[PDB]
Amino acid sequence: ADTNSWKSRTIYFALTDRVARSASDNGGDGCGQLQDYCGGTFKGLEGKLDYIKGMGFDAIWITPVVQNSARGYHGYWASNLYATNSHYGTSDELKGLVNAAHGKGIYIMVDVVANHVGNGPLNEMQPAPLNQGSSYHPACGINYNDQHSIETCRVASDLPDLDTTDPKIRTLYKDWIKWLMSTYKFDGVRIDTVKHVEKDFWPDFAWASGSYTIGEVFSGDPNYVAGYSKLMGGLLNYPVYFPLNRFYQQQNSSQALVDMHNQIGSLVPDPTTLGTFLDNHDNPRFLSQKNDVSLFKNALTYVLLARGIPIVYYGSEQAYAGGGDPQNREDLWRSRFNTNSDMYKFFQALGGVRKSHGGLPGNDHVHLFVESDAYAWSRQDGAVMALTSNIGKGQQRQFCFFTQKNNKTWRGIFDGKTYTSGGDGKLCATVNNGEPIVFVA
Ligand SMILES: C[C@H]1O[C@H](O[C@H]2[C@H](O)[C@@H](O)[C@@H](O[C@H]3[C@H](O)[C@@H](O)[C@H](O)O[C@@H]3CO)O[C@@H]2CO)[C@H](O)[C@@H](O)[C@@H]1N[C@H]1C=C(CO)[C@@H](O[C@H]2O[C@H](CO)[C@@H](O[C@H]3O[C@H](C)[C@@H](N[C@H]4C=C(CO)[C@@H](O)[C@H](O)[C@H]4O)[C@H](O)[C@H]3O)[C@H](O)[C@H]2O)[C@H](O)[C@H]1O
Ligand SMILES: OC[C@H]1O[C@H](O[C@H]2[C@H](O)[C@@H](O)[C@@H](O)O[C@@H]2CO)[C@H](O)[C@@H](O)[C@@H]1O
Ligand SMILES: [Ca+2]
């Protein structure tokens, strides 16, 4: 599917090894060693498509699917591009997962790596010429202040860095992504390690995909990130990630979030193609950093209802709180896939708002109220409106703001209350327990 189709999607980002063990997995004692395979499978994820859909997601980003070197539970350590990772299942089981998702109106986005291979023996790498030393840069330690180093040095000391300027390597990866997409029928691609490969590799690779591509450029600098924005369909919104977290963890005002939202939006071709996220598999979970479910809900209100494509990290809906990798990659079966959890029902409510408004694909995010401790905005000409704050659990405040809609009525989706703006479009609302208020006409 094309960029335009993805703009209205809502993405659940899952580690395949960490969702479900089988079609019959309805929960169990968790996985003890999070640095090793926990036993999630394609067939297990297939049995959880209803669980995912029931919160309002209509797309799943899965970690890489290719055969990996030892202990590559996360998929990022390729050893054979043209074989599936047997720990998750066979090729036919991967097709069955995708086909099951398509039958339920769900897109599958596949994560891919072109920068590097795994840490297994060179002589087991496939296909040719990946088993030749000459296919790689000599090993060097990355200096993140030097772009040459970022591109030619190793992302980790044991992960050989491909010589991506070699025409033979460029054709290997183009032919491979075309085969992958044709064979398995994926709807989109997440491109790992984009800043680690020279820019002129990317357009041909992205176009070979045949679908929307979203790139990972791990940087808070919006100028740097936006320099990749014309090479692929969208980018992960790392620039917003930083001040998003600083506001909702009570570290800074909302002004830096609004500033960065405006700045990155102005620098890319189409800010509706950016992927908005609060946490992921490479950073501690929100609740590890700030143990306050009210603040998490406020932050997630931005993720779900701001401009851009929301990307929610699996386990958020069970209030997971693990810290740095691998502790942020807890299995989901320990939670027993509780569809009555507080966070599950929260995601389900915001998913219903998105569904009733077309998946909110517009470039129509109007800042309404921007203060030390509060942020409100609307979408769709005032049809949907969010008031968020960083006051925290157990706190009450009144916030009054101009809605730009005269004499208009909304319903609070959480509290059921009727909210009416005045003749001047001014609305006052009182936040309770630090919880966000979402308003729908
Ligand atoms: C992970 C991420 O790293 C890089 O991001 C950098 C970024 O480029 C930097 O600029 C900087 O970011 C700055 C930012 O620019 C600023 O604007 C902001 O203000 O501050 C931030 C933070 O300073 O830092 C980040 C993070 O370092 C890449 O650019 C990015 O693409 C990466 N994300 C991708 C990439 C990969 C690789 O495909 C995936 O990671 C996977 O592979 C790693 C490496 O194997 C694995 O790591 C875990 O397992 C390792 C084995 C373990 N290391 C142990 C092994 C040793 C010997 O072998 C010991 O030497 C070592 O001490 C041991 O700990 C790792 O610690 C452990 O994390 C991942 O699990 C695996 O997933 C990413 O997932 C993918 O999204
Ligand atoms: O509630 C204060 C103020 O917030 C908003 O103004 C933003 C503006 O939209 C941003 O572009 C940037 O300039 O930050 C301003 C706040 O410092 C509302 O737009 C405005 O109506 C309201 O009074
Ligand atoms: Ca490289």
Side-chain angles (χ1 to χ4, degrees), residues 157-218:
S157 290
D158 62 347
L159 302 183
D161 197 67
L162 282 151
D163 186 7
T164 44
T165 58
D166 184 330
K168 297 209 296 206
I169 298 305
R170 294 186 172 187
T171 56
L172 186 80
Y173 277 83
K174 288 171 46 146
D175 290 346
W176 170 74
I177 194 61
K178 285 176 192 192
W179 165 84
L180 187 81
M181 300 300 284
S182 182
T183 299
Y184 298 106
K185 308 293 183 202
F186 298 123
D187 304 283
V189 177
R190 179 268 193 182
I191 307 176
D192 191 58
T193 35
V194 164
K195 72 189 258 186
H196 298 277
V197 176
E198 72 286 348
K199 288 186 172 71
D200 59 280
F201 183 93
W202 292 117
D204 287 350
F205 184 82
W207 270 90
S209 305
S211 298
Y212 173 72
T213 47
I214 190 169
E216 185 228 16
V217 178
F218 197 143

Side-chain angles (χ1 to χ4, degrees), residues 255 258-259 262 366-371 374 376 400-402 404:
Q255 185 76 50
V258 163
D259 291 350
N262 290 337
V366 177
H367 314 295
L368 300 178
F369 185 57
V370 180
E371 302 294 334
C400 302
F401 64 92
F402 290 100
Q404 308 180 210

Side-chain angles (χ1 to χ4, degrees), residues 158 305 308 437:
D158 62 347
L305 304 179
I437 305 176

Side-chain angles (χ1 to χ4, degrees), residues 40-57:
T41 69
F42 300 142
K43 283 170 152 165
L45 178 56
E46 185 184 7
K48 295 290 170 286
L49 295 177
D50 286 339
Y51 167 88
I52 296 166
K53 192 168 181 196
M55 283 177 286
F57 298 104

Side-chain angles (χ1 to χ4, degrees), residues 13 15 35 61 64 73-77 111 113 115-116 119 142 144 150 155-159 190 192-196 216-221 224 236 238 242 280-283 324-326 329:
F13 166 41
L15 266 63
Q35 74 286 5
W61 161 2
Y73 70 83
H74 47 61
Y76 293 109
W77 293 353
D111 202 333
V113 183
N115 179 67
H116 63 270
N119 52 16
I142 287 183
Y144 277 107
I150 290 169
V155 69
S157 290
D158 62 347
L159 302 183
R190 179 268 193 182
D192 191 58
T193 35
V194 164
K195 72 189 258 186
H196 298 277
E216 185 228 16
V217 178
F218 197 143
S219 173
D221 174 346
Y224 182 84
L236 294 167
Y238 261 113
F242 299 99
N280 65 21
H281 62 317
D282 292 336
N283 295 275
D325 175 2
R329 297 166 181 205

